[PDB]
């Protein structure tokens, strides 16, 4: 590289911040988005103890911290912590001053306006970027698949949203946003582990339960048969070693944790599973583009990485859909970073180069410029 100017494709997310320069294949720095103040007193003098460890540093000292995510469900609830996370991302994980780089944030659909306006105001006043643009997290995941149609189910860690798109024309009346995501699955797993004796309570042990969920849980092809099998044999019980020994054995908690996605009544949510909100999102579309959406169903986001979900979802939709249509579920192996790869592709386009929100434009219309033509 050299002259010229590259764009910063940041992607706030909720659970893992993924960032990197535009035009690459994978994000340069991926690290949890947690800011944890120490909670004990501290007796050693001169140890160089800081007041807040952010990012991946607080996943190593988590034994004496109180980690707290600054993004609850897509929306940002603690602006100071989010500013700290952004400052860390720019200066220590990428080491590029923001004064010389455009930024491309990402935002979930149907989020509060004030969140987006505050985001752009921060990026323009504190970090003082040249130009920033906010994009919907599902259109990027559709970019990365190299398609131009299809209905994308982006089940992140904060919020699961399902944006249908045809021929490049998004259908704003058919977006079905559901707030069940990876975090609720972690909490439900932590709640059902108590049925064997293992109690995880501290906010640090939520990370251990998350690791258990990632490494062991899988989505059952048929729920009742698995419940019957796990209750007779013992071929499912997989063991796992805690960070201090005392291995634990997970029985039928393995496929009961991610089953909450298809039956949100487990955690008390009323709505229908991710297998039926996709069909409802399709049926709201026009009658002539339903075949294409059926054939190009796209999966993205981290939580769709459970082993065996691309078959359960296809079976469910085939049960719901008319018998003639072909149901195909696109599940690329690079699912987790699909949104960021799409963001890199979009930022690398020449046609897109004039859509950025230039700073002089913000100076003339204020932060409310984001809702205007420069979307």
């Amino acid at each position: 590289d050299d002259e010229e100017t590259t764009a910063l494709v940041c992607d706030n997310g909720s659970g893992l911040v993924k960032a990197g320069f535009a035009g690459d294949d994978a994000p340069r720095a991926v690290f949890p988005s947690i800011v944890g103040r120490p909670r004990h007193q501290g007796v050693m003098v001169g140890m160089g103890q800081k007041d807040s460890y952010v990012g991946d540093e607080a996943q190593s000292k988590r034994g004496i911290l109180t980690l707290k995510y600054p993004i609850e469900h897509g929306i940002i609830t603690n602006w100071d912590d989010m500013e700290k996370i952004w400052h860390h991302t720019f200066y220590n994980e990428l080491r590029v001053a923001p004064e010389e780089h455009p930024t491309l944030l990402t935002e979930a659909p149907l989020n509060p306006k004030a969140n987006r306006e505050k985001m752009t105001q921060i990026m323009f006043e504190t970090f003082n970027v040249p130009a920033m643009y906010v994009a919907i997290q599902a259109v990027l995941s559709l970019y990365a698949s190299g398609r131009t149609t299809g209905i994308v189910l982006d089940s992140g860690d904060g919020v699961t949203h399902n944006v249908p798109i045809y021929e490049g024309y998004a259908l704003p009346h058919a977006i079905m946003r559901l707030d069940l995501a990876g975090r609720d699955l972690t909490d439900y797993l932590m709640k059902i582990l108590t049925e064997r004796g293992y109690s995880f309570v501290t906010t640090a042990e939520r990370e251990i339960v998350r690791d258990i969920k990632e490494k062991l849980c899988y989505v059952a092809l048929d729920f009742e048969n698995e419940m019957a099998t796990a209750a007779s044999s013992s071929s499912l019980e997989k063991s796992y070693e805690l960070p201090d020994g005392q291995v634990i054995t997970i029985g039928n908690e393995r496929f009961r944790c991610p089953e909450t996605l298809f039956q949100p009544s487990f955690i008390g949510m009323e709505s229908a599973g991710i297998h039926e909100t996709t069909y409802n999102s399709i049926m709201k579309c026009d009658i002539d583009i339903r075949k294409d959406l059926y054939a190009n169903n796209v999966l993205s986001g981290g939580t769709t990485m459970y082993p065996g979900i691309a078959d359960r979802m296809q079976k469910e939709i085939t049960a719901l859909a008319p018998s003639t249509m072909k149901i195909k579920i696109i599940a690329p192996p690079e699912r987790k970073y699909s949104v960021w790869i799409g963001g890199s592709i979009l930022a690398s386009l020449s046609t897109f180069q004039q859509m950025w929100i230039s700073k002089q434009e913000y100076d003339e219309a204020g932060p409310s410029i984001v809702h205007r033509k420069c979307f």
Partner: protein, 126 residues
């Protein structure tokens, strides 16, 4: 065979193409000069009284109006060509494209950098 010879052949083709483009540009300049010599007859109006000057100016005005009508027709045809080109490019992007997304690479192995940073600079390449 190998690939370096193919690269040399490709570079020779590119240089030949540049030479041909330069030759065609020179030919266009020569033809423009020939057209200036042909259409634009030498016009000397020295010593003529006012009446002949007025008559010749009016005739040149009529000829310029005719040339402007011709130029308007040609420019309209050029706009037609631009419209056709835009339509064809749209059709190509719709049909020949789809899976014609760019193929970018930024994940090069920084092995040589690590070797040069932790083991001196014995390597005389990088």
């Amino acid at each position: 065979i190998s690939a370096s010879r193919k690269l040399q052949l490709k570079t020779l083709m590119l240089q030949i193409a540049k030479q041909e483009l330069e030759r065609e540009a020179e030919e266009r300049r020569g033809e423009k000069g020939r057209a200036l010599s042909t259409r634009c007859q030498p016009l000397e109006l020295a010593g003529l009284s006012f009446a002949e000057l007025q008559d010749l100016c009016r005739q040149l005005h009529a000829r310029v109006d005719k040339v402007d009508e011709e130029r308007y027709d040609v420019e309209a045809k050029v706009t037609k060509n631009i419209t056709e080109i835009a339509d064809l490019n749209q059709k190509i992007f719709d049909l020949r494209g789809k899976f014609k997304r760019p193929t970018l690479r930024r994940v090069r192995i920084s092995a040589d950098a690590m070797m040069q940073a932790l083991l001196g600079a014995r390597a005389k390449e990088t």
